């Protein structure tokens, strides 16, 4: 439970504050003098653009979290799509709104599932030597681990499979399994 609207303004202010910086730099590199207040005359469409993305990213990434009540990598995907989408509307092309939504959403989703080490990677706090040794020398697992998570069948026919099949078929189809005796004798 987080305030999506309260967060959204903060995201717009931070990202858009950077927009004023590049707007002020673009103003200073202008060859023709236009005046100090031209920061919001022609360069306004840069800071306004940047804060639009920051609010669009932070609000949607916050709003999606409140809808599902779980913080994971996906929340930054939806915020990435809407940040990418809002960067498209400036261009005005339907291909471009989706192209940026695809780019920004995948990049931002990829860095949350991976946990990009830009601010620093996770600390194991455990013996790295034994983590490597345990994974390498574990060569046989109990059959329950594979069966519970690759299923039973498709060539995975553990002992007792046929008896389990007879019961499973009985509850779903109501037919007793009894193949014919395939021989005049006996």
């Amino acid at each position: 439970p987080k305030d999506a609207v309260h967060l959204g303004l903060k995201g717009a202010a931070v990202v858009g504050g950077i927009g004023l910086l590049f707007a002020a730099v673009r103003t200073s590199l202008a060859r023709k003098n236009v005046g100090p207040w031209a920061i919001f005359t022609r360069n306004g469409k840069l800071a306004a653009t940047f804060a639009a993305v920051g609010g669009a990213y932070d609000f949607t990434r916050a709003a999606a979290a409140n809808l599902r009540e779980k913080e994971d990598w996906v929340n930054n995907g939806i915020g990435g799509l809407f940040a990418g989408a809002t960067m498209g509307l400036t261009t005005g092309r339907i291909p471009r709104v989706l192209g940026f939504a695809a780019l920004t959403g995948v990049v931002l989703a990829t860095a949350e599932y991976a946990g990009s080490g830009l601010r620093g990677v996770f600390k194991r706090d455990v013996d790295e030597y034994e983590r490597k040794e345990f994974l390498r020398k574990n060569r046989r697992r109990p059959i329950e681990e594979t069966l519970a998570e690759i299923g039973e069948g498709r060539g995975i026919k553990p002992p007792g499979y046929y008896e389990r099949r007879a019961q499973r078929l009985k509850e779903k189809y109501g037919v007793d399994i009894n193949p014919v005796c395939a021989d005049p004798d006996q």
Binding site: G153, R165, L169, Y173, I177, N178, P179, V180
Partner: peptide, 19 residues
């Protein structure tokens, strides 16, 4: 349909379906 059917040695009294 993955794992749904198997023909291998199905007699009369068994079923093609396994799932």
């Amino acid at each position: 349909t993955d794992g749904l059917w198997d023909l291998r040695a199905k007699r009369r009294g068994d079923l093609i379906s396994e799932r």
